[PDB]
């Protein structure tokens, strides 16, 4: 019996994988998880957390 | 430890005896209260009579042959007190009360047997000397028990027949003590006394 300060079982609001079923995107993510894990470069993580993004948060350049 | 326990209810207090019983007869001892007419209950006679009349007042209006059955005898008074301490609406309590037998006076099977005493219910030990107490025989006779003058005619008879037994046994006892005292100086006994015996 605990007096909780914070809401319990609070999902992180982010997405740790895409919503799509694209095989090639899944493979790119397979690659960049490896790199982000086994590399100390933050470029890899940025690219990774960008590969997850919606069509509106992934706009055109 | 005994299989059956015969209890002389003379100079005993009612609830203080009945609780002891109601626990022992639930734990599984067969108990036989005897000489229930000489039981005692605290407080004065007029007070206890008022309480019994308050109990008699309570009867089912629409048909009084349904309601509190006011038993007037002492055996049944004590049975009421015990049954109130027991869950008689269950098999546990019914079985328990089947292990009980209460009597006025001391009948044949229990006159030739040994009677015991509950000391945590005795009037002389529990009550302050000078307090007024009440006798269940006089009470029952006041509320409509018609057999006080009979158990008396039987108890004196039992007592005569018991006192002659004691008069014989006492002589046998002194003879046995005088026969055993002629061996106490012996090496069979001053070797026992080294072990407390």
């Amino acid at each position: 019996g605990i007096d909780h300060t914070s809401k319990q079982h609070k999902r992180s609001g982010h997405r740790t994988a895409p919503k799509s079923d694209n095989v090639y995107l899944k493979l790119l993510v397979k690659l960049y998880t490896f790199l982000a894990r086994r590399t100390d470069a933050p470029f890899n993580k940025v690219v990774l957390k960008a590969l997850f993004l919606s069509k509106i948060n992934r706009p055109p350049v | 430890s005994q299989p059956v326990v015969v209890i002389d209810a003379k100079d005993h207090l009612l609830g203080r005896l009945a609780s002891t019983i109601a626990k022992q007869v639930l734990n599984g001892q067969k108990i036989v209260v005897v000489r229930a007419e000489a039981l005692n209950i605290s407080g004065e006679f007029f007070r206890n009579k008022l309480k019994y009349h308050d109990f008699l007042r309570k009867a089912t209006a629409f048909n009084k042959t349904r309601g509190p059955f006011h038993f007037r005898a002492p055996s049944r008074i004590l049975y009421k007190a015990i049954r109130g301490m027991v869950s008689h609406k269950t098999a546990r309590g019914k079985a328990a009360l089947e292990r009980l037998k209460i009597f006025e006076g001391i009948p044949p099977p229990y006159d030739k047997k040994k009677r015991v005493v509950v000391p945590q219910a005795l009037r002389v030990l529990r009550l302050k000397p000078g307090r007024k107490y009440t006798t269940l025989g006089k009470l029952s006779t006041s509320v409509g028990w018609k057999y006080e003058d009979v158990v008396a005619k039987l108890e004196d008879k039992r007592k005569v027949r018991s006192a002659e037994y004691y008069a014989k046994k006492r002589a046998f006892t002194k003879k046995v003590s005088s026969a055993s005292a002629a061996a106490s100086e012996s090496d069979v006994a001053k070797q026992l006394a080294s072990f407390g015996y």
């Binding site: - | 639930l26 734990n27 599984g28 546990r92």
Partner: protein
């Protein structure tokens, strides 16, 4: 010669319970002669048997046994607790079990 026994007789009083709630996993035993928790601490670990009858002879006997042990004490009057393999049936409230001396420390 008339006696052959090596046990102490006791009574199955009840289950462990609150008011209005019972725990049949735990049973209460009243041992004879015992009047305190000290002098009941001797009977801890000791085995217990409830010996009863049944009409179907199994393995060559009509009598049947439910084994258990003494675990710990109860408050201020020499009652103890017991835990059997298969808990007791509640019709034994006021029935004689027999406590052995088999695990001894004398």
């Amino acid at each position: 010669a008339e006696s052959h026994r090596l046990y102490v007789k006791g009574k199955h009083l009840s289950y462990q319970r609150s008011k209005r709630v019972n725990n049949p996993n735990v049973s209460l035993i009243k041992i004879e002669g015992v009047a305190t928790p000290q002098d009941a601490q001797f009977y801890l670990g000791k085995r217990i048997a409830y010996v009863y009858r049944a009409s179907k002879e199994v393995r060559g006997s009509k009598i049947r046994v439910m084994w258990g042990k003494v675990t710990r004490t109860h408050g201020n009057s020499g009652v103890v607790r017991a835990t059997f393999r298969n808990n007791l049936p509640a019709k034994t409230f006021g029935a004689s079990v027999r406590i052995f001396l088999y695990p001894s420390n004398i």
